[PDB]
């Protein structure tokens, strides 16, 4: 639909911008980009409207530009409460809104750090309820953002791939899994099944085989 | 300023209607520049804008929704609603009310939202958890064992290890609802790769709304 970048961050003080690339039905089709901040079980508020327009009430520190199919949020001095999930919108010729799928802007409190991935086949014990799940969990990460993607045989997995939103840990880190649902005969069909996540634009997999 | 507050079931069973409500606060004062709309947000995905009413009542559906779906509004209550006909899992979502504004500077934005009001579809009640467990299979010198918790329903369930002793490199993890209306977690813990053999790891998994409570012993394979 519309793309934006899963994570975003920078230190108090210091500057990020978000982008958000769509076709030219929608971004470059007009002038009604607008995008929106979000703090976990609150109202999301519109923080751009019309591409560049920022609403009196909110912050200065934001703004809003467009270049090709390409729109762009920049955040200024970076504080604390500018910590949340923005997403931007765009009306569409064809009479409709589309939405990116959102970028969490973490405004750095602490070392970044690398999320421990173990992957585990499904148990003998599953198998005989006619069963079969592997389970990626994937700990100790920050910032609280990860992409997993699956793969059998070297070839992406679509079906049957279940994701957790990430969640804080009592350290303040962030925990998530992903479960990738098979049959038991899908599971001896194959040679090998990959874990593999991206945080920070660093690839780490695990893999395992029957 | 103005205000968006929602009103929903909490759960529906699939099959049935949901409906929610939208009670606008705040002096309102209705416009033809206001469109009120209803939007949705997936487990971990994207957003759906599902439609609007506007003005003297006239409605905007999305066309893949379309045929299930009426807005409606009742002004005497400062109100708008949505009612979506035979749901499944997959309509399983936090829903949001919008306006949405046709004012210059603000044109096809959402300038007010409501703060969502979560919607899980299943056809559980209670139903306790199969325990799997998750054998142990590096440069710390560690291994992760773990216990699978799969399908139950509804949340929540607890999981310590060797009855609350070990805490250390414990971590129970979110749940994930499957295509079921089920949910599965697990919880690993990190332990000496040298103890494997000399040490005994239990989980202790309970799930209040079933009355179950399961304990297993998790080795190496
Ligand atoms: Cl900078
Ligand atoms: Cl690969």
């Known amino acids: 639909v519309l793309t934006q970048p899963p994570s975003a961050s920078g230190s108090p003080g210091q500057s990020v911008t978000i982008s958000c690339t769509g076709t030219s039905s929608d971004v470059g089709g007009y002038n009604y980009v607008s995008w929106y901040q979000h703090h976990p079980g609150k109202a999301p508020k519109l923080i751009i409207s019309?591409?560049?327009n920022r609403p009196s009430g909110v912050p200065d520190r934001f703004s809003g530009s467009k270049s090709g199919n390409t729109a762009s949020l920049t955040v200024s001095g970076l504080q604390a409460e500018d910590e949340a999930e923005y997403y931007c919108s765009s009306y569409t010729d064809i009479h409709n809104f589309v939405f990116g799928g959102g970028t969490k802007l973490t405004v750095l409190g602490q070392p970044k750090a690398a999320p421990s991935v173990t992957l585990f086949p499904p148990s003998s014990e599953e198998l005989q309820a006619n069963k079969a799940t592997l389970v990626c969990l994937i700990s100790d990460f920050y910032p609280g953002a990860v992409t997993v993607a699956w793969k059998a045989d070297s070839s992406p997995v679509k079906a049957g791939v279940e994701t957790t939103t990430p969640s804080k840990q009592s350290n303040n880190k962030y925990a998530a899994s992903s479960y990738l649902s098979l049959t038991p005969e899908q599971w001896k069909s194959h040679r090998s099944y990959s874990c593999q996540v991206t945080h920070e634009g660093s690839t780490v997999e695990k893999t395992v085989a029957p | 300023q103005v205000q968006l507050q929602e009103s929903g079931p909490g759960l529906v069973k699939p099959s049935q209607t949901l409906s929610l409500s939208c009670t606008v606060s705040?002096?309102?004062?209705?416009?033809?520049?206001?469109?009120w709309s209803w939007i949705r947000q997936y487990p971990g995905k994207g957003l759906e804008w599902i439609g609007y009413?506007?003005?003297?009542?006239?409605?905007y559906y999305n066309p893949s929704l379309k045929s299930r779906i009426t807005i409606s509004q009742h002004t005497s209550e400062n109100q708008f609603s949505l009612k979506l006909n035979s749901v499944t899992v997959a309509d399983t979502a936090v829903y949001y009310c919008?306006?949405?504004?046709?004012?210059?500077?603000?044109?096809?934005?959402?300038?007010?939202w409501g703060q969502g009001t979560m919607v899980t579809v299943s056809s559980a009640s209670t139903k306790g958890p199969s325990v799997f467990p998750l054998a142990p299979s590096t440069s710390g010198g560690t291994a992760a064992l773990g216990c699978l918790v799969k399908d139950y329903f509804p949340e929540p369930v607890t999981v310590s290890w060797n009855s609350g002793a070990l805490t250390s490199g414990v971590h129970t993890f979110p749940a994930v609802l499957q295509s079921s209306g089920l949910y599965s977690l697990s919880s690993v813990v990190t332990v000496p790769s040298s103890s494997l053999g000399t040490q005994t790891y239990i989980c202790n998994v309970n799930h209040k709304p079933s009355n179950t409570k399961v304990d297993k012993r998790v080795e190496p394979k």
């Open positions: 009413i506007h003005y003297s009542g006239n409605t």
């Open positions: 019309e591409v560049n």
């Open positions: 705040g002096g309102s004062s209705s416009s033809g520049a206001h469109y």
């Open positions: 919008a306006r949405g504004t046709r004012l210059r500077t603000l044109r096809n934005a959402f300038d007010i």
